[model samples]
Target: GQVKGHATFVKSMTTEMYQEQQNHSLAYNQRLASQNRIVDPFLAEGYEVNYQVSDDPDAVYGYLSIPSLEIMEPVYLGADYHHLGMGLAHVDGTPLPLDGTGIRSVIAGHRAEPSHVFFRHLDQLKVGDALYYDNGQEIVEYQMMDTEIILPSEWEKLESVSSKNIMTLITCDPIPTFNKRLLVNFERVAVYQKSDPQTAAVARVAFT
Candidate 1:
C-alpha cells in the first residue's frame, strides 16, 4: 500500500500510501509539538530509539528520495537495529522531517547490506543535487551543499541550527573499514503542497 525501498522505480504512490503516510506524519508532529523533548544525539550498541507516537515500533515516519542515487526509502522513527535493517533510520535527537524551519532532521542508513542496498551509492551524490522528503502532507526539496567524512565522536556537526532548515544524511564510510561517517548536508530549497492539485500532478509526473 505504501512506498517501499524500491518505490522510486515503481514511480507511483497510491492513495492508500498517502493516507498511511499522513497518519504517521500527524502523530509525529503531535509528539514533537507537545513534549519538545528531543534528546541528545546518541546511538548505543545497536542504535538508540527515537521519540515517536506509534504503538507500532516500525511505523513509517516519511519517505526520503534522492533522485540522483535513485534512493526512495521509507524512514522509521529510530536508528535501532530493526529500523535500520528495514529501511532508513531517523536519528533520535533530531526533529522529525517537515517540522518547519531552523531544525535539522538526520537520517542514517546502511551503506552496504547483505541482500539490500540503501545508501550504497550515496557517495555519488554531488553538490547541488536535490533530496526530497515526502512527509505525506507536503514534499520538501533540499539542495545538497556539502559532503564530509567525520568520526563518530564528531556528531556535534549534526546539531540543528536556528538559521536554516537542514536534512543530514549519514552512513558508514570507507566501505570496507567502516570507521568513519559520511555526511551529506542539505538545505531546504523548495516546497510543494500535496493538497494543491497542480503541485500534486506535477510531483506525480516528475516521478513517473
Candidate 2:
C-alpha cells in the first residue's frame, strides 16, 4: 500500500510538472508582446487589433483589442498537439479560417507577477464586453458570452466549433492552479471595414 501510494504521488508530481511546462510556454508567447517581424506581416498586424486564427502549431500566439472593455494583450494559442493538461484552445492540424465567422478562435495566457496579461483577466470580462480584431481587411467584434471552469482533461468543450463565430479565452484556474483551466467564451456580433474612420481611430488608440 505504501509503495502504491508513493507511485501515485510521483505520477501526480509528473503531471503537474508537465502542466507547468505548458503554462510557461503559454506565458512566454504572451510575453512576446510585440509581434515578431520574421513571422508573416499580415499575421503580425492581425494581432494588434484584428481577429486572427493560428496558422501553424508554432504560430500559437494572438492578440485582441476591445476598446469598450479596455482590454488589449497578446494571448497564447494553445494547440491540440500540446495538450499539456490544458484543453485544446487552438487545434494544431486544422486551419480555422479567419473569415470572422465559424469555429472558436481560442486564445490563452497566464496571470503572472509582471502584470495580469492575456487570459489573466478572463474572469474580469463580463457579458457584453466587446472584443475587436483587425484582420487587415476588416474589424471583427465579439461579445463576451460566458465563463466556466473545466477539468484539464475536458478538451472537447474547447475544441468544438459551433455555427456561430466565437472567441474562447482560457487560463489556469484558482489564479495559479495547475490542475484546472478557466475558459471564457465569446460570440462574434458584428464586422466592420478596417478603413472606416471610427475603426481606424479605435485601432490607433488601442494599438499605439
Candidate 3:
C-alpha cells in the first residue's frame, strides 16, 4: 500500500504554511506501528493506509465542492497524515460515498492552514449553505444542517450521524491547536447520475 506522504507524512495545508513537525511525524509513525490492529473480532482484520496517485482520467475519486465556500478539491482515500497534505481526505473507518449510498462519509482538511487552503473558510459556513460532491459518475447535493464544536477526544462525534446518507466535514478549529474540532454536517438532498440511471437496477438485479 502506498502511504500518502507514511509514503504517512500539513498547514491550513501549504507552502510557507508548514513543515515537518516532530509531533506530526511521530504520531504518523505510531499509526504506522499499529497499522494492522484488529480492533474487532466480528469484522475483517484491520488494514493500513494506502496511497495511490490517480491515473483514472475519468476521476478515480471524483471531487468535493462547496459552493458556499467556493471549495472544490480532490477527495482521496485515507485521511492519514500524508493524504491531508495533498487534499481533502476521506477519513478511515467509513465507506467511500456514492450518490445513493447509505453511509455518512466524514472528510477532513486543515482549516485555513494551507496556502492551499482546503477548508480555510469552512467555519464561515452557516446553516442552509449547499455542498456538492461530483466524482465524475454522479453528482450529489447536500444542504448544511448544523455546526458543532467538540473536543478531540469525543469519539462519538463522527458516529453521531443517524442518517442513511450524508457527509460531514471536519477540521481543527483556531488553526494549529488540538483542543477542539469544528464539524459541519450535511444532509443529502439529490443525486444526479451521469450514466444511464435505469441501468443501475439491471446491474443490481443481475448480481442478485
Candidate 4:
C-alpha cells in the first residue's frame, strides 16, 4: 500500500503542478514543462528523445538546443534540485540574451540525465560548438568560448569575453563525490529575428 501510494502521490503531484502552470501562463513554452516527463526508455512505435539546459534560478521561460550534442529540451525557470527532473531552466536575475552587453544568461543542465540524454559527455564539446534558444519570439545563437572545472565555492568564475551576450552552461562532474562543476561559457554570435519572413522559412522545395 505504501509503495503504490507513493507512486500515486508523485504522479498526481507532478500532474497537478504541470496543469496549474499550463492553465495560466501567457505563452506556450511557459506552459510546456507541464506536458511531458522522463518516460520509460522504451515506448510506442514512434518516440523521440529529449534533454535540458538553464538559469535565472527560474520557470519555463523557453527552451535550449545544442546542435552538436543533439540536445533539445524544454526549459524551465529555476535551476534548483527539484527543477532538475523537469527541464533546462534559466537562473533567475541573470541578464537575459539580447537584453544588454556584458549581459549573461546562465543555463544549468543535468550530468546524471534523463530521457535517454546525458550531460556527462558535455565535456567532450569543442570550443566552437553551437547552441540555440528559441524563445517563441527570436532565435538566439551562441558559440562555445570557454570550458572549465570549478568548485561550487567559486561561482563567480563564469566569465571571459568582454561585454558580450554570454551564456554559461553548468553541470556536475562525473567523478565520484561530485565536488566539481563543468562550466561551459557561450557568447551570442548571431540573432535571428522571428519577424523576418526569410528567418521563418522552415523548408524549401524546388518546383522546377
Candidate 5:
C-alpha cells in the first residue's frame, strides 16, 4: 500500500470573499471603459494602485487547474513580482478570469524556481486537454486550442480577440537558458458553477 502524505489546505471562503472578487473584476472593467488606459503587466512601469480587492496581503482572484499537468495553483491579480512569487498571476490589462465573452485572461507562471516547479512541465500538455479556472463561485472550463513559442517581445500575440473567451497560460521556455515563452491557448468550452445553473453549455469551437 502507498503511504499517504500531508493534505492540501482548503481555505474557508465567505460571502464577503465572493463579493470582493466580483467587485474587483467589475471595477476593473469600469475603470478600463471610463479611463481607456491599459497597462502592460510585463513591460509597464507600474499598475493602478487603487484597483484592489481587499486589504489582505494575500488577496487572490481565483485558482487554475490543469488536470493533465496535475496543477492547481492560486492565481492572483497582476503579474507583479510579489504576486508571481506566491503562484500564478493574472496579467494586468487583460480581463480577469471571469465568465464572459470577449475575455482573454493571460495567466503567467514561472517555469522553474528554487523551491517550486511551477510550470516546468507545461509542455506535457497537448492540444485538446482541459484547463479550469474557478473564480470563487463559478468554474470556467476551457479546452487547449494550441501552443506556440514566441520571443518575449512578441506581446502582440497576447492581444484579446473580440467575442472570444480565452485563457492563455504563459511561461519561459528552454529551461535553464530561458529566453522565449511557451504560450498555451485555451478557449472556453463550458461553464458551470459551485451550484447548478439553468444556462446551456457553450458550443465547442474547432481548433484554428
Candidate 6:
C-alpha cells in the first residue's frame, strides 16, 4: 500500500472532494466484505469459482477475495483478458476441466485508488496468509507462497506446475499506474465444510 505521504496531494484537495473520496472508500470496503461472505460458503464447498457472467458481454466482471488478507470484491475482468471469460480454475493436474473442478476461478482487476481492490495490497501479504473458498461441497484454503511482478504476456506461467493446487492473483502495476503487472501466488493448504465429517465434527454448531 502507498504511504500517507504519497496521499498528500489528495489531502490538499477541496474538503468536499476529500470527504467524498473517504466516503467512497468506506462504501467500497463494505461492499467487498458483503460480497466476500456471499461467496465464502461456495468456496468452502469446493464448487467451481468464476466471475458472475452478466448479460453484457463486454462488461468487466470477476470475483475477488482472500480470507487471510481480508480482501474481496468484484472487479472489471478486462474484455481482452484470457481464459475464455470464465476465469481460470481446474482440478490439479487436469486439462482445465470445467465441469469436474469445484470452480472455474480467475483473478483480474485494476490497480488504482477508489477502484483499486485486490492486488493493491498484494505486497502486504506475508508467508502464512490463508485464502479460503467454499465451492458448495468443500471449503478450500490456499496459503501465500510468493509474490512478484511479471509482464502481462507471461500469463502461461501462472498455472500450477505441481499437483499441489493453488491460486494466482494478478493486477495492473503501480497503484493507479497500470504500466506493469503484480502477481501473487498461493498454494492450497486446507479445506473445511459441513459435509466433511472431520471438519463438521470440529466446527461450532448452532441450531436454528
**Per-residue accuracy of model 1 over 1-208 as CA lDDT, tens digit each:** 2343335422445667656655665565556545434332224324345454455677666677887776767887777666778788887666666646577778888888786688888888888998877765567888998888878877567776557878988888887988888888899987887678767663563343
Question: How many pairs of residues in model 4 come into backbone collision?
Answer: 17
Q: In model 3, which residue pairs have backbone atoms overlapping below 3 Å?
A: 2-51, 3-7, 6-9, 11-113, 12-112, 12-113, 12-114, 13-113, 13-114, 112-120
In candidate 4 the C-alpha lDDT for residue 51 amounts to 20
| Full-model lDDT for every candidate | 0.70, 0.49, 0.57, 0.55, 0.68, 0.42
Error of 3 at 140 (Å): 0.6
RMSD of each: 4.6, 17.2, 13.7, 13.1, 6.2, 16.1
Per-residue lDDT over 34-108 for candidate 4, one digit per residue giving the tens place of the 0 to 100 score: 643322111111133122222133435555667667676666555555556666655433434444566666667
Q: Per-residue error at 42 for model 4, in Å?
A: 28
TM-score of each model, paired residue for residue = 0.77, 0.57, 0.63, 0.64, 0.78, 0.49
**CA displacement after TM-score superposition, residue 112 of candidate 2 (Å):** 2.4
lDDT value for candidate 4? Answer: 0.55
Give a tens-digit lDDT track for model 5, residues 1-208: 0001101111345667777768877777556545433444444324654456666645656767776776777777777667777788877666776667777778888887676767888898888998866665566788998889988777767767568888988888887778888988899987765556432231111100
Candidate 6 lDDT over 1-208, as tens digits, reads 2223212322344546534533543343333323331221111223333322323433322223465455544333222223223232222211221122232233444344354343456778888786654332344566788877766555445544555555666566775556566767777666665456776532222100
Cα displacement (angstroms), candidate 1, residue 162, comes to 5.4
Using TM-score as the measure, what is the rank order of every candidate, best first?
5, 1, 4, 3, 2, 6
- Tell me the RMSD of model 2 versus the true structure: 17.2
Model 4 CA deviation exceeding 4 Å by range: 1-59, 114-118, 159-161, 200-208
Best by lDDT, which number?
1
Worst 10 residues of 4 by lDDT: 38-47
The better candidate by TM-score, 2 or 4, is: 4
**Model 3 C-alpha lDDT per residue in residues 1-208, reported as the tens digit of each score:** 1112211121122322212222332334334334332121111222464422232212224467776566767776666555666678766554455434456667888765445778878888878887766544445778898888877666456753564677888887766664577888888887765366764542232112
